Amino acid sequence: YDIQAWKKQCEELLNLIFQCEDSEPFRQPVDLLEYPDYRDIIDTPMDFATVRETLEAGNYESPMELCKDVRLIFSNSKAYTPSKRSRIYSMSLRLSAFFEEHISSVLSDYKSALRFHKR
């Protein structure tokens, strides 16, 4: 019922995501010299370095907020991709599955801890 445990759990999950070759495209912002139209399509850029920095700054209040920003990485890839069979989009789907498989217990435990705190 540790209300704070989600933060280190998310740090370790981000470490695992940074070890995944599938995170390569999502570790830093999109360069506009490489993708000049990116911001015509994507209103809110997001990447895993930004998520990690936000977490380490103490600027997430809950793992739900972190989850929303991670899910934005993946929705941005789905919105930007010209094809559902693109390399970078295909990498996003595997990384998303990995992320969802691991974040589920982090969210469940946090929400359970908060309920216990308010019992």
Residues, the chain, total? 119
Cα separation, 27 vs 48, in Å, equals 5
Which residue stretch of 11-19, 60-68, 86-94, 98-106 sits at the interface with ligand Y1J (rule: CB under 6 A)?
86-94
Contact with ligand Y1J (CB under 6 A): which of 35, 101, 105, 112?
35
The pair of structure tokens assigned to 26 is 């999502």
Contact with ligand Y1J (CB under 6 A): which of 50, 54, 81, 90?
81
Q: Find the angle CA(113)-CA(17)-CA(93) to the nearest 5 degrees.
A: 100
**Residues at the interface with ligand Y1J (CB under 6 A):** 24-26, 28, 30-31, 34-35, 77, 80-81, 86, 88-89, 92
